[PDB]
Amino acid sequence: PEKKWLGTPIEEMRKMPRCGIHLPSLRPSASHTVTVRVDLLRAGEVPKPFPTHYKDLWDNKHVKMPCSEQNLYPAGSRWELIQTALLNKFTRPQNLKDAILKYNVAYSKKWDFTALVDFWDKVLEEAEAQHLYQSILPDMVKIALCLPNICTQPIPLLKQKMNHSVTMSQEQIASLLANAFFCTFPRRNAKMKSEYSSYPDINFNRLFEGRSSRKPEKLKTLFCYFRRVTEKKPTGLVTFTRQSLEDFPEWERCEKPLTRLHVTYEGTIEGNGRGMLQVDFANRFVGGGVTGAGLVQENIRFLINPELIVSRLFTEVLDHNECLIITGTEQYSEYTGYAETYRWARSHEDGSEKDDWQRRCTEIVAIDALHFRRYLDQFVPEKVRRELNKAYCGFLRPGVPSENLSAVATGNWGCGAFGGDARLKALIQILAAAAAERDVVYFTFGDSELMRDIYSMHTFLTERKLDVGKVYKLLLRYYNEECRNCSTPGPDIKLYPFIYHAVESSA
């Protein structure tokens, strides 16, 4: 009949907050921006900002804030215009359109609001729609205009090559995302913009356009979030860390043993990987590409844990050797389905514990797989190393002892319609985690046959005591003997059968 899970029992895997290191005092440093008063940080209490009063930096190293004195429009304060536009009664979707357009006159022809209109009138029921413009919208306006009182410290841009963290409160994020809803962020809109060309869009204008059925679902999911945040203010902190490694394992010679594996075709990363390092199948432009298009794994996580979206404000396109690590985000929505079948189910009430820094024990890492538009490309040794390096970067924690690292909760990273081979990518992640000295928890999402195969291969390589280097050498043998001279889209003999054969015919 076939089992539901294989390998190590999931309750034997290291998980937060149990496995956690003893956190030192939270404090600002060269590599850590802290936007809250640490001495006044108390459990279940809304964090006070630091500094007390708004300081502005309008430069190329910080986020260009909408409440800045240097944000200008036809010449006067664009922020005071934002205030006059938003301090109005909404009763019809066009009011909100005309409000957002008052400080975006150049995009009146480019920004379509049809999806907003049709959500307002067709999707929402009368009472649901009334509640939106009577309460939710005015409450989002109020927290959006309180931005200079809420976010007082200039937020550094996490540029490529930077190894830097930013710890802010959820309440601060709420105000930033509310601003992103109303499309207040300057310099972020133009097609021929220069400074932020290598950053994803932050303004939510694209969620209002078109005649697609995906749009109302994304709006349901976000309005759920905004409803919660405006009715009951969140009290925790969230950390955003960009990691960028220059040096990587010498994969051919790496002597590190494979680690433990739990593999299952039932469960989810977000549901069953609680307290573990949860992988986000990212786009290099985090949160779903420059544009935010799609309802795929990354898009979904960003919608159900909306606080992740704010990373699009200050996170530059990820390079090959980089990742973004986010600790502390809350789950607000529950969902069903995927892509065209994605549906908002109901609100979620997050019951996870917190660490000493008041961050929820939820660690997500954004690692972008490559898009293999030609199938064979991934077996090319350099492309394997690339995937190895990207995964390793997401899993490695410099200076943290292995017994303090949670298991990695992951799945079919970059696979399916993205072109990656599940069996290869499973092996790549396994090797990467071994080099990082973390155990693996792998979700195959319904594919029971894949669960088996990954399990059999892991067991094979563990019992035969093949280290990372020995396994990686098998991947090179596969390319040379089966891939480089292949005239067909895929080779006659698959990876795993070749690996078994290669090892069984040795010594």
Author numbering: 442 to 515, 525 to 957
The authors write:
Reversal of PARylation is predominantly carried out by poly(ADP-ribose) glycohydrolase (PARG) in nucleus and cytosol, whereas ADP-ribosylhydrolase 3 (ARH3) may play a role in mitochondrial PAR degradation. PARG comprises an N-terminal regulatory/targeting domain and a C-terminal catalytic domain. The mouse PARG catalytic domain has a bean-shaped structure, with the active site in a deep cleft in the middle on the abdominal side.
To understand what caused the activity difference between the mPARG E748N/Q and E749N/Q mutants, we solved the crystal structures of these mPARG mutants. Interestingly, while E748N and E749N mutants were completely dead, both E748Q and E749Q mutants still retained residual PARG activities. In contrast, the signature loops in E748N and E749N mutants have significantly different conformation from the wild type PARG. In wild-type PARG structure, Cβ and Cγ of both E748 and E749 residues are semi-buried. Mutation to Asn, which has both Cγ and Nγ linked to Cβ causes a spatial collision. Therefore, the conformation changes in this catalytic loop completely abolish activity of mPARG E748N and E749N mutants. To study the enzymatic mechanism of mPARG, we tried to soak the catalytic residue Glu748, Glu749 mutants E748N, E748Q, E749N and E749Q with the iso-ADPr, which may be the smallest PARG substrate containing the α(1→2) ribose-ribose glycosidic bond to be cleaved by PARG. In all above four PARG mutant crystal structures, we were not able to observe the electron density for iso-ADPr at the “active” site of mPARG. For E748N and E749N mutants, this may result from the conformational change in the active site associated with the mutation. Our work revealed precisely how some of the PARG mutations (e.g. E748N, E749N) disrupt the PARG activity through significant conformational changes in the PARG active site.
